[PDB]
Design a protein around this ligand. Structure first.
Ligand SMILES: O=C([O-])/C=C(/C(=O)[O-])[C@@H](O)C(=O)[O-]
Ligand code: SF4
Length: 753
C-alpha cells in the first residue's frame, strides 16, 4: 500500500490502514449496522475479526495494539515483570519517558540537574533495559509522556496502550489510546493478544463554538460534573458535532485527557482539519495525507448508536473550576467565591500552577501569557506564587523563542522542568506547614487528598491555565475575570480582556535539545544490573500458585468508608523513590484510606494484639503469622491512577481478596493480574452486614466459572453466620491467572517449563 512510517524514529514500521479497513469490513458484514468511530478503530484491531463475539459491555475483545508507551514511575515495574518473563526483545514499538521523578524546588535547569544526580540509579536501569530489550528512551527533561506522544507518536486510527491513566490524551489526534497497568503492557510487548472488555459508547455532541474566556478544559470540567467520577466506567466517550471544528488539536487532547476522571476507558474525536494542521506542523504531513485517503474509516458511520448521548452547547458554556477534593464537584468561576465562603474553603490562593499533561501545550502557554501581559501593562504582578510547566522540550524552546516564557517570568512565575512535578506530589513545598488549611488552584486534572504536597488539608481546584493566571494575579477565589476589576499601579481600575493566542507557532516549532535515545538494534549486549542491596530496585520473586482450597476464616484488614482512589491505596509524592522496589513501597499500603471503625486514616485494630496501628505494619504482622486477609471497600474502589503497585502491594503483604460495591476498571484488571480476587457485592446493601470484627469464608473457588457468583459466609463473633453472594467479571483466561498465582506465572507456565 503506502509505506508511511509510524514515527520519525521507526522508519521501517509502517502504518497499516489497509489492515484496519480489512478488519472493519469483516466486522460490519457480521454486524450489519453503523459503527461508531471507536468501534471502527477498536474492532479494526481485533486479533480475530471473523470469530470474535462482540457485545458492548459484555464480551472481552482480544486486540493487537500498535505500540506501547511507558513513563518512568510505572516503567520500572513493567520492565521488572518483563525481565521475569525471560523474553529477549519487545514485539511492538515501545518507549520509556522520564517525566515523573523530577522534583520542583529551584525551577527549570537546576531541578533537572539535581534529578539526574539523585535518580541516576533508576535512569540508568531504564536506559540499560531499554537498550537491551529494544525500547526507545526519552531522557529526563524531554517532556511529560502524553505531550511527547501527541507530538511524535499518536496518529488517526492508532491503537496505543500506555502505563498511565491519561494515555487517552492521544484521542485528540483521532487514535484510541488506553491506559493500562504494567502487566498489561508486558502482554503486548511479549506478543500475546491484549484483552479489553467491549466498551459501551457515550456520544457527546458539541454544538456552537468556544468564545472568550471559555476554553477546551471547560468542556471536560462540565462533562465531569454531569457524568460524575464514575459515570464513564466501561465506556468510550466519542465527541462529535459541529462544535468540534471550533477546538484546536491540543484542545481536543485536553478534553480526551480528563475523560480519565469520569472512569472512561478512553475518549476520541473524529479526524478533521485541525488534526491535519497539527500533523503537518509536527513534521507528519505524509501521515495526514494517508489519513485523508482513509478518512471514511476515521470518522463515525452515519447514524451510529450511542448508548448515552449528551449535548453541550459551546456558545453557552462559561469558565468552570472543579473541586476541592474530587474533580467532578463543578462550579462556574462566577460562583466559586460564594460557595467557598459558604463551605469554609480558604479564599486566598497561595499558589497557582499551570501545566500537567492536561494543559501544557503551546496554545495554553500563549493564552496564559495573554492574561499576564495585560497585568504587566498595568504594572501588576502575581499576588499568589505562580509556577509554569511546559509540556515538552519543543514547547519550552518555542515559547521561549516566541516570547511567552519571559512574559510569564516577568509577572512573577517560575518555569519548572518539563515534568509532572507538583502534579504527582514531586514538589518541595515549604510555604505551609503540614495540616495547614490552604487553597491552591491548578490547570491539572486530579485534586485528591494530599496528592500535590502530601498535606491532606490543601484544597486544590482544577481549572484552565488562563483562569489560573487570572486568579494568581488577583490572589483570591473571590475574583471573576469576566466581570471584576483590578487596580493598576497608576490608580486606574481595569478589566482583563479574554485571552487570544495562536493554537500553534506561526513559525515552525523549535525542537530544543536532543533527548531521544534509540535502542542499538545491533548490540543489545547490555547486562541490566540491579544491585541486591538497592533501596530503589528489586527483582521480583514470583507469587505463590493457588493451593486448590477455598479461602476460609479470612481476617478483614480494613473496611474502607467512602472514596478510595489509588492515591489513597498507594500514595505517590515521596514514595515514587521506591517504585522499582516492591517491599519498600509496600510500607505505604492503604495509609490514606478512611477506616469505618474509627473514621481515621492509617489506624486499624490488630485482631491479635488488640492495638490500633498503621495498616502496613498490621498487614505485615498478619502475613508473618499466616493470617490471610481481605479489604472491604465501598463504591468505585481504586479510582484514579493506573499504578499497579496498588494491586502488587496487597498481594505482597498477604491479601487475598478485595470485596467492594464497585471497582474502577484499571484497578480491577490489575488485581486479577496479580492473582487477587476482586469481587463485588451481588447486593450492595450487604456492605452493611460486614463488621470489621467478622471473619469471611469465600467458597466455590473449585468450580470458579465466568458468570457464576461465589458464596461468602460472614462468620460473626457471637456465632451467627450469614451467606451472601459475590459477583466477579472473570472469563476463563483470567481464572487461569488466579489458579497460577498471577498472569506472569501463567505466561511462564506456557513457556513449556
Ligand atoms: O502513579 C503513576 O505513575 C501513574 C499515574 C497514572 O497512571 O495516571 C500518574 O501519572 C498519575 O497521574 O497518578
Ligand atoms: S496526570 Fe500529572 S502525574 Fe499523571 S502523567 Fe499527567 S502530568 Fe504526569
Amino acid at each position: 500500500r503506502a509505506k508511511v512510517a509510524m514515527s520519525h524514529f521507526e522508519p521501517h514500521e509502517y502504518i497499516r490502514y489497509d489492515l484496519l479497513e480489512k478488519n472493519i469490513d469483516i466486522v460490519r458484514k457480521r454486524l450489519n449496522r453503523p459503527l461508531t468511530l471507536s468501534e471502527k478503530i477498536v474492532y479494526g484491531h481485533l486479533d480475530d475479526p471473523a470469530n470474535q463475539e462482540i457485545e458492548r459491555g459484555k464480551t472481552y475483545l482480544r486486540l493487537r495494539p500498535d505500540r506501547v508507551a511507558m513513563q518512568d514511575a510505572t516503567a520500572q515495574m513493567a520492565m521488572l515483570q518483563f525481565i521475569s518473563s525471560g523474553l529477549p526483545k519487545v514485539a511492538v514499538p515501545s518507549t520509556i519517558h522520564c517525566d515523573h521523578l523530577i522534583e520542583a524546588q529551584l525551577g527549570g535547569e537546576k531541578d533537572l540537574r539535581r534529578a539526574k544526580d539523585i535518580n541516576q540509579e533508576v535512569y540508568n536501569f531504564l536506559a540499560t533495559a531499554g537498550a537491551k530489550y529494544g525500547v526507545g528512551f526519552w531522557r529526563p527533561g524531554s517532556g511529560i509522556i502524553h505531550q511527547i506522544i501527541l507530538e511524535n507518536y499518536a496518529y488517526p486510527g492508532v491503537l496505543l496502550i500506555g502505563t498511565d491513566s491519561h494515555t487517552p490524551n492521544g484521542g485528540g489526534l483521532g487514535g484510541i489510546c488506553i491506559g493500562v497497568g504494567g502487566a498489561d503492557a508486558v502482554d503486548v510487548m511479549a506478543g500475546i493478544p491484549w484483552e479489553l472488555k467491549c466498551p459501551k459508547v457515550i456520544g457527546v455532541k458539541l454544538t456552537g463554538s468556544l468564545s472568550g474566556w471559555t476554553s477546551p478544559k471547560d468542556v471536560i470540567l462540565k462533562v465531569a460534573g454531569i457524568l460524575t467520577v464514575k459515570g464513564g466506567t466501561g465506556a468510550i466517550v466519542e465527541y462529535h458535532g459541529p462544535g468540534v471544528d471550533s477546538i484546536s488539536c491540543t484542545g481536543m487532547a485536553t478534553i480526551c485527557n480528563m475523560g480519565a476522571e469520569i472512569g472512561a476507558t478512553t475518549s476520541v474525536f473524529p479526524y478533521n482539519h485541525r488534526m491535519k494542521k497539527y500533523l503537518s506542523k509536527t513534521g507528519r504531513a505524509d501521515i495526514a495525507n494517508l489519513a485523508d485517503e482513509f478518512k471514511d474509516h476515521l470518522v463515525p458511520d452515519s447514524g451510529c448508536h450511542y448508548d448515552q448521548l449528551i449535548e453541550i452547547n459551546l456558545s453557552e458554556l462559561k469558565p468552570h473550576i472543579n473541586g476541592p477534593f474530587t474533580p467532578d464537584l463543578a462550579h462556574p468561576v462566577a460562583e466559586v467565591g460564594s460557595v467557598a465562603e459558604k463551605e469554609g474553603w480558604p479564599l486566598d490562593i497561595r499558589v497557582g500552577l499551570i501545566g500537567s499533561c492536561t494543559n501544557s501545550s503551546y496554545e495554553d502557554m500563549g493564552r496564559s501569557a495573554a492574561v499576564a501581559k495585560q497585568a504587566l501593562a498595568h504594572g501588576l504582578k502575581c499576588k499568589s506564587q505562580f509556577t509554569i510547566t511546559p509540556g515538552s522540550e519543543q514547547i519550552r524552546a518555542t515559547i521561549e523563542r516566541d516570547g511567552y516564557a519571559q512574559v510569564l517570568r516577568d509577572v512573577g512565575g517560575i518555569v519548572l522542568a518539563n515534568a509532572c512535578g507538583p502534579c504527582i506530589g514531586q514538589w518541595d513545598r515549604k510555604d505551609i506547614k503540614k495540616g495547614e488549611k490552604n487553597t491552591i488552584v491548578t490547570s491539572y486534572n486530579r485534586n485528591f487528598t494530599g496528592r500535590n504536597d502530601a498535606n491532606p488539608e490543601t484544597h486544590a481546584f482544577v481549572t484552565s491555565p488562563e483562569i489560573v493566571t487570572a486568579l494568581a494575579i488577583a490572589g483570591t477565589l473571590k475574583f471573576n475575570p469576566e466581570t471584576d476589576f483590578l487596580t493598576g499601579k497608576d490608580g486606574k481600575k481595569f478589566k482583563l480582556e479574554a485571552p487570544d493566542a495562536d493554537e500553534l507557532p506561526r513559525a515552525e516549532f523549535d525542537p530544543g535539545q536532543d533527548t531521544y535515545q534509540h535502542p542499538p538494534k545491533d548490540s543489545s549486549g547490555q547486562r541490566v544490573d540491579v544491585s541486591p542491596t538497592s533501596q530503589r530496585l528489586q527483582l521480583l520473586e514470583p507469587f505463590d500458585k493457588w493451593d486448590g482450597k477455598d479461602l476460609e476464616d479470612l481476617q478483614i484488614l480494613i473496611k474502607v468508608k467512602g472514596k478510595c482512589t489509588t492515591d489513597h491505596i498507594s500514595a505517590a509524592g515521596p514514595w515514587l523513590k521506591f517504585r522499582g522496589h516492591l517491599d519498600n513501597i509496600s510500607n505505604n499500603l492503604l495509609i490514606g484510606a478512611i477506616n469505618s471503625e474509627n473514621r481515621k486514616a492509617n489506624s486499624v485494630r490488630n485482631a491479635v494484639t488488640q492495638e490500633f496501628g498503621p495498616v502496613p505494619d498490621t498487614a505485615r504482622y498478619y502475613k508473618q503469622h499466616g493470617i490471610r486477609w481481605v479489604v472491604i471497600g465501598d463504591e468505585n474502589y481504586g479510582e484514579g491512577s493506573s499504578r499497579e503497585h496498588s494491586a502488587l502491594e496487597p498481594r505482597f503483604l498477604g491479601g487475598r481478596a478485595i470485596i467492594t460495591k464497585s471497582f474502577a476498571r484499571i484497578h480491577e484488571t490489575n488485581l486479577k493480574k496479580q492473582g487477587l480476587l476482586p469481587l463485588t457485592f451481588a447486593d450492595p446493601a450487604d456492605y452493611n452486614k460486614i463488621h470489621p470484627v467478622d471473619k469471611l469464608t469465600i467458597q466455590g473457588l473449585k468450580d470458579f466459572a465466568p458468570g457464576k457468583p461465589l458464596t461468602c459466609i460472614i462468620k460473626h463473633p457471637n456465632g451467627t453466620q450469614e451467606t451472601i453472594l459475590l459477583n466477579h467479571t472473570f472469563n476463563e483466561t483470567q481464572i487461569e491467572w488466579f489458579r497460577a498465582g498471577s498472569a506472569l506465572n501463567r505466561m511462564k507456565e506456557l513457556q513449556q517449563k
